[PDB]
């Protein structure tokens, strides 16, 4: 996250970090005790990818951290139906053993298709991660967050040569300087409603982070809420 | 009442019903209060809420 601020412990208790052949390479969010939602581009491979819930500072021990192995990865069936589009950039990860929900490990709420879109359209959400703190720069040690404004679709369309689908949205500041960045991908875009946070997007992609006239691109979660619900049922 | 105006006063979700509309509802982990509008935690760690004190010092 470029130009954000340190989260406090337990401020985003649905946030997780993904580790593998690279540490902290992507974020995700807790759907329930057994399931994480993330970006499919993060998990095109699975070799001992590990999830850490209850994380705050990546170089220290807080004694809130819950580490789990991923046993199953389900990318959206239509992801990679079209080469290099990032269309349908969402995936589910099933954990080997359930998380123990507590104040530092709590799911994000997921509303139905209609209300996720309503909540998105409220026009302000929070984004968080341990991604780069400057474009082409280093990664964050303490979890970062940032309020990003929703950007109107026509503006976003003009901001890039790349295709922006109906399954995506843009968010950010016209002046640049503050943005999501690489390493943040897969993490939550969330909208707080009377103190309860709902998942409204997945941090997906972008061009140079925080550059004026460029915006973060997010997966429109409303389009995928029925699929998430269907896949992540507990028995 | 309609869902049109201030979400039928529903804390979370609103659906229009015959004329005297508004039936409010809540997401998993919450229950509709007797008050019929607000949403009460029905579990120890309900989704989407911060429970670690953020005001420290
Ligand atoms: C050096 O500037 C950059 C230029 C391009 C990109 C970049 C990264 C990922 C993706 S996915 C995608 C697509 N969905 N078409 C387009 C695109 C562009 C990132 C940059 O910096 C972070
Ligand atoms: C190949 O290198 C890559 C480099 C960067 C990214 C990547 C990932 C997330 C975000 S958010 C953002 C923003 N401007 N908000 C820009 C950006 C760029 C993806 C890549 O490939 C998967
Ligand atoms: Ca730590």
DSSP B1-57: --TTTGGGG-SSEEE--SSS--EEE--TTEEE-TTSSSEEE-SSS-TT---S-S---
A205 close to ligand 1 (CB < 6 Angstrom): yes
CB-based contacts of A26, cutoff 8 Å, min separation 6: A17, A18, A38, A39, A42, A43, A183, A184, A185, A186, A187
Biggest alpha carbon–alpha carbon distance for chain B: 51
Known catalytic membership, residue A56: no
Contact A55, A69 (CB under 8 A): no
Q: What is the total residue count of chain A?
A: 235
Residue nearest to atom 4 of ligand 2 (CA): A182
A111 CA from centroid of ligand 2 (Å) = 27
What residues of A are designated binding site?
A: 55, 57, 60, 62, 65
Q: In sequence order, which residues have a C-beta less than 8 Å from that of residue A7 and are 6 or more positions away?
A: A15, A56, A128, A142, A143, A144, A145
Question: Domain A1-12+108-222, CATH 1.10.287.110 — does that match?
Answer: no
Would you say the C-alpha torsion A213, A170, A196, B51 has a positive or negative sign? negative
Asked how this structure was determined, the answer is X-ray
B11 contact residues in A (CB cutoff 8 A): 194
CATH 2.40.10.10 domain locations along chain A:
1-12+108-222, 13-107+223-235
| CB distance A26 to ligand 2 below 6 Å | no
- Specify whether the CB–CB gap between B26 and B54 falls below 8 A: no
Q: CATH: 2.40.10.10, 1.10.10.60, 2.60.40.1220, 3.30.2130.10. Which one for A13-107+223-235?
A: 2.40.10.10
Which residue's CA is minimally distant from atom 15 of ligand 2?
A216
Nearest to A19 by CA among A93, A90, A79: A93
Nearest to A228 by CA among A74, A60, A97, A122: A74
CA dist., res. A13 & res. A30, Å (int): 8
Domains of chain B: 1-57 (2.10.25.10)
CA of A168 to the centre of ligand 2 (A): 15
Q: Find, among A154, A135, A145, the residue nearest to A197 by Cα.
A: A145
Residue of A80, A131, A170, A205 to test ligand 1 pocket, by largest number of atoms within 8 Å of CB: A205
CB contact under 8 A, A115 and B13: yes
Helix (H, G, I), strand (E, B) or coil at A80: coil
């Amino acid at each position: 996250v470029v130009g954000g601020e340190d989260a406090k412990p337990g401020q985003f208790p649905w946030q997780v970090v993904l580790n593998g052949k690279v540490d902290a390479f992507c974020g995700g969010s807790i759907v329930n005790e057994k399931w994480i939602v993330t970006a499919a581009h993060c998990v095109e491979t699975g070799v001992k990818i590990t999830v850490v819930a209850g994380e705050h500072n990546i170089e220290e021990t807080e004694h809130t951290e819950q580490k789990r192995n991923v046993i199953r990865i389900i990318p959206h069936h239509n992801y990679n139906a079209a080469i290099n589009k990032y269309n349908h950039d969402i995936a589910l990860l099933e954990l080997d053993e359930p998380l123990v929900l507590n104040s530092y490990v709590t799911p994000i709420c997921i509303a139905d298709k209609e209300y996720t879109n309503i909540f998105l359209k409220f026009g302000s959400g929070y984004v968080s991660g341990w991604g780069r703190v400057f474009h082409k720069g280093r990664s964050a040690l303490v979890l970062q967050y940032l309020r990003v404004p929703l950007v109107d679709r026509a503006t976003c369309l003009r901001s890039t040569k790349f295709t922006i689908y109906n399954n995506m949205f843009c968010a950010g500041f016209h002046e640049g300087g503050r943005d999501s960045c690489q390493g943040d991908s897969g993490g939550p875009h969330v909208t707080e409603v009377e103190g309860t946070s709902f998942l409204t997007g997945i941090i997906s992609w972008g061009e140079e982070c925080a550059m004026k006239g460029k915006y973060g691109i997010y997966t429109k979660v409303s389009r995928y809420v029925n699929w998430i619900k269907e896949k992540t049922k507990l028995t | 009442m309609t869902c049109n105006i201030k979400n039928g006063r529903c804390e979370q979700f609103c659906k229009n019903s015959a004329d005297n509309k508004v039936v409010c509802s809540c997401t998993e982990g919450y229950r509709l209060a007797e008050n019929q509008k607000s949403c009460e935690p029905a579990v120890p760690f309900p989704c989407g809420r911060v429970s670690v004190s953020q005001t420290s010092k």
